[PDB]
Design an enzyme around this catalytic site. Sequence first.
Site, PDB file in Angstrom:
ATOM      1  N   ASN A  45     -13.618 -14.222   7.791  1.00  0.00           N
ATOM      2  CA  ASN A  45     -12.299 -14.613   8.281  1.00  0.00           C
ATOM      3  C   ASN A  45     -12.308 -15.305   9.630  1.00  0.00           C
ATOM      4  O   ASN A  45     -11.468 -16.147   9.886  1.00  0.00           O
ATOM      5  CB  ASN A  45     -11.357 -13.418   8.341  1.00  0.00           C
ATOM      6  CG  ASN A  45     -10.724 -13.128   6.982  1.00  0.00           C
ATOM      7  OD1 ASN A  45      -9.688 -13.690   6.651  1.00  0.00           O
ATOM      8  ND2 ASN A  45     -11.348 -12.263   6.209  1.00  0.00           N
ATOM      9  N   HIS A 101       5.449  -3.768  10.907  1.00  0.00           N
ATOM     10  CA  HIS A 101       6.790  -3.579  11.462  1.00  0.00           C
ATOM     11  C   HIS A 101       6.800  -2.217  12.148  1.00  0.00           C
ATOM     12  O   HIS A 101       5.848  -1.465  12.015  1.00  0.00           O
ATOM     13  CB  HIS A 101       7.855  -3.662  10.366  1.00  0.00           C
ATOM     14  CG  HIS A 101       9.259  -3.665  10.888  1.00  0.00           C
ATOM     15  ND1 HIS A 101      10.176  -2.703  10.543  1.00  0.00           N
ATOM     16  CD2 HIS A 101       9.919  -4.541  11.691  1.00  0.00           C
ATOM     17  CE1 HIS A 101      11.338  -2.957  11.132  1.00  0.00           C
ATOM     18  NE2 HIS A 101      11.208  -4.070  11.841  1.00  0.00           N
ATOM     19  N   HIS A 147       2.752   0.489   9.482  1.00  0.00           N
ATOM     20  CA  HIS A 147       4.127   0.580   9.997  1.00  0.00           C
ATOM     21  C   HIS A 147       4.140   1.499  11.205  1.00  0.00           C
ATOM     22  O   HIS A 147       3.613   2.607  11.137  1.00  0.00           O
ATOM     23  CB  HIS A 147       5.061   1.145   8.925  1.00  0.00           C
ATOM     24  CG  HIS A 147       6.497   0.897   9.235  1.00  0.00           C
ATOM     25  ND1 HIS A 147       7.167   1.577  10.231  1.00  0.00           N
ATOM     26  CD2 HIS A 147       7.367  -0.017   8.745  1.00  0.00           C
ATOM     27  CE1 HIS A 147       8.406   1.116  10.313  1.00  0.00           C
ATOM     28  NE2 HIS A 147       8.547   0.142   9.432  1.00  0.00           N
ATOM     29  N   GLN A 191      -4.087 -10.292   6.154  1.00  0.00           N
ATOM     30  CA  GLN A 191      -4.227 -11.063   4.920  1.00  0.00           C
ATOM     31  C   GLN A 191      -2.902 -11.212   4.157  1.00  0.00           C
ATOM     32  O   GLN A 191      -1.855 -10.810   4.650  1.00  0.00           O
ATOM     33  CB  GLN A 191      -5.299 -10.435   4.028  1.00  0.00           C
ATOM     34  CG  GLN A 191      -6.698 -10.528   4.716  1.00  0.00           C
ATOM     35  CD  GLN A 191      -7.793  -9.883   3.895  1.00  0.00           C
ATOM     36  OE1 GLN A 191      -7.665  -9.706   2.684  1.00  0.00           O
ATOM     37  NE2 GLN A 191      -8.892  -9.539   4.556  1.00  0.00           N
ATOM     38  N   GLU A 217      12.285  -4.259  16.880  1.00  0.00           N
ATOM     39  CA  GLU A 217      12.906  -2.981  17.262  1.00  0.00           C
ATOM     40  C   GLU A 217      12.463  -2.395  18.612  1.00  0.00           C
ATOM     41  O   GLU A 217      12.730  -1.220  18.901  1.00  0.00           O
ATOM     42  CB  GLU A 217      12.708  -1.955  16.149  1.00  0.00           C
ATOM     43  CG  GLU A 217      13.181  -2.447  14.781  1.00  0.00           C
ATOM     44  CD  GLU A 217      13.550  -1.314  13.870  1.00  0.00           C
ATOM     45  OE1 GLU A 217      13.649  -1.511  12.638  1.00  0.00           O
ATOM     46  OE2 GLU A 217      13.755  -0.213  14.383  1.00  0.00           O
ATOM     47  N   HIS A 256      -5.258  -7.713   1.654  1.00  0.00           N
ATOM     48  CA  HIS A 256      -4.053  -8.219   0.980  1.00  0.00           C
ATOM     49  C   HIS A 256      -3.097  -7.114   0.578  1.00  0.00           C
ATOM     50  O   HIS A 256      -3.516  -6.137  -0.034  1.00  0.00           O
ATOM     51  CB  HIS A 256      -4.443  -8.964  -0.285  1.00  0.00           C
ATOM     52  CG  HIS A 256      -5.641  -9.869  -0.137  1.00  0.00           C
ATOM     53  ND1 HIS A 256      -5.543 -11.168   0.316  1.00  0.00           N
ATOM     54  CD2 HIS A 256      -6.963  -9.656  -0.398  1.00  0.00           C
ATOM     55  CE1 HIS A 256      -6.749 -11.728   0.310  1.00  0.00           C
ATOM     56  NE2 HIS A 256      -7.629 -10.818  -0.101  1.00  0.00           N
ATOM     57  N   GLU A 299      12.277   2.004  15.654  1.00  0.00           N
ATOM     58  CA  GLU A 299      12.842   1.796  16.995  1.00  0.00           C
ATOM     59  C   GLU A 299      12.140   2.652  18.063  1.00  0.00           C
ATOM     60  O   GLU A 299      11.869   3.832  17.859  1.00  0.00           O
ATOM     61  CB  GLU A 299      14.360   2.053  16.992  1.00  0.00           C
ATOM     62  CG  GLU A 299      14.731   3.493  16.700  1.00  0.00           C
ATOM     63  CD  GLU A 299      15.396   3.678  15.347  1.00  0.00           C
ATOM     64  OE1 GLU A 299      14.761   3.353  14.306  1.00  0.00           O
ATOM     65  OE2 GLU A 299      16.557   4.157  15.336  1.00  0.00           O
TER      66      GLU A 299
HETATM   67 ZN   LIG Z   1      10.123  -1.111   9.262  1.00  0.00          ZN
HETATM   68 ZN   LIG Z   2      -9.613 -11.227  -0.466  1.00  0.00          ZN
END
Ligand SMILES: [Zn+2]
Ligand SMILES: [Zn+2]
Lengths: 205, 205, 205
Positions: free
Chosen positions: C194, C73, C114, C67, C54, C109, C76
Amino acid sequence: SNIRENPVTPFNPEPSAPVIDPTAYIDPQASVIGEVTIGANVMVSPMASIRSDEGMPIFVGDRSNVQDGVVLHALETINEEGEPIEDNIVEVDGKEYAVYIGNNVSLAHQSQVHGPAAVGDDTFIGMQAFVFKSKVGNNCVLEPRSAAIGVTIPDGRYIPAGMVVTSQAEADKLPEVTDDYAYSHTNEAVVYVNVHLAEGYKETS
Amino acid sequence: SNIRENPVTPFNPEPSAPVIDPTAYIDPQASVIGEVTIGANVMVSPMASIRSDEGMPIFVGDRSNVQDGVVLHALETINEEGEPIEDNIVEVDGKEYAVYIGNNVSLAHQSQVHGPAAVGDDTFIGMQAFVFKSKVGNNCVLEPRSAAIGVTIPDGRYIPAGMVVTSQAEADKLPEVTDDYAYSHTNEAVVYVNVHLAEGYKETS
Amino acid sequence: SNIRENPVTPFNPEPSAPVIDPTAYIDPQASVIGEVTIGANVMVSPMASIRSDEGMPIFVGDRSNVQDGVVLHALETINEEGEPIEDNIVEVDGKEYAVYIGNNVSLAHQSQVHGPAAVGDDTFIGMQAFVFKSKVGNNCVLEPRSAAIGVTIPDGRYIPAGMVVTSQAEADKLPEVTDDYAYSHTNEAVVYVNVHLAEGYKETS
Ligand SMILES: [Zn+2]
Ligand SMILES: [Zn+2]
Ligand SMILES: [Zn+2]
């Protein structure tokens, strides 16, 4: 491949591959990595991720189901110096696991069980529910959006939708599953359906 | 293939394949299984799972969007003996569905609508929200992390972020969407954007 | 391919491909689309979706981890007429982003960040947590199932499990991370693990 070994790291000297019963169905869009044992007639749905790459086994018992988007993972159980981290291991019937999922357990869509954790037989873990550093007993019901963190849930109790239980004093006073309770028969129905779906999906592969 | 038929089971004698409008975009990393109808200009994003393998259709109306990690699934609507389970079926304009998603509906990232359920036109189902055994009216807003379980949400109402609504008495007193409400125009903007994304993604396939 | 360009739309005249450091590991079952920059030693797990289609960049800093099932996301940031929507852009060190994830950040996880949103260095975003229209400072902890919407979280604070923070007055009175706090060392341990997993997974590809 979507069924894979875990990698070599300082807390995992030897790669393990999953041990999967021939009667289990693993969807091609699920991921299963590392030291995982999956029992008979288990159904693993699209977008589930079962990832055992930090040491110690993740076990999923017979006739259990791991539904869409469910995540199973666990905290490190062996530190860099080879020393087992006992706080991050659960003991079930004399054996050690990072995550233990018993028999006839339903892990419903988008739930997550993160080790250390154990979930007893015939328990329903509801949609979007969360279990972490907890032992959930047998014949329990976690309603959708409930969570159990750092507690032991006694056998035969339920956690109402949306309730986040973080203290043992709360877990001890949870209500009991009775025959008239709305979810008292839910798990048996879900297990029955999923055992049949696993066999039907196996016949298409 | 990520677009697949459902399997044969005792509650599904005949496999069905999804019916997908040619103008819809289904991401290659989404999963769509079974008796599903997807309308025009619908966008289905990565990691969504739409799974209709327990009987009865899941319907997604025109210009709706099913965002990343969304799950649509439903309880059994026909038992082993061929008998329709009426509690698990919703009726919309004289037709029966397991899940009905209307036109211009946004199912935002990681939300879940689990049948039996109906969601009316021009409704925004917010990130990580949950709808189960409920009818959500038209022009509603479920803010992120809200949930509606076992209730009817009247047209033009919103559920504040994090609120889990489980009783009709609560659903009846929800606040109304007004022009000054922060999410009053959110769905129209999201629909406009997603209809255009669907066409752009189609031009890359 | 699971690493892809975004499509041409009226709010995106030119497709962008992700810029990924050679030392990062992107799981084959993750999705990364569009104008995304991923830093060194980053691990992106199965079923994560990072989607920048976007306008404006999504940035994931060095030694961070995304994770399983995490979604990134953004709203716009440029409308149909080429005009930047300033409310939907965050500024970090003189540069504009739709989503900024700092260095040494853990997105655990099934969490979701956003845009517009920024998350400062060395912050743990717990399992199933949600961040939207917020700036989270450095050295913060969002416990599992917490959420921050429309707020600024000061450096060094934590949000208790399940708490949904929607007003600045609440965010200002959050408790401080101290050495005795249960999650005070969690992020450093998760980052260490990680970074090592990313290198181990790279050696299997
Ligand atoms: Zn979105
Ligand atoms: Zn874990
Ligand atoms: Zn279901």
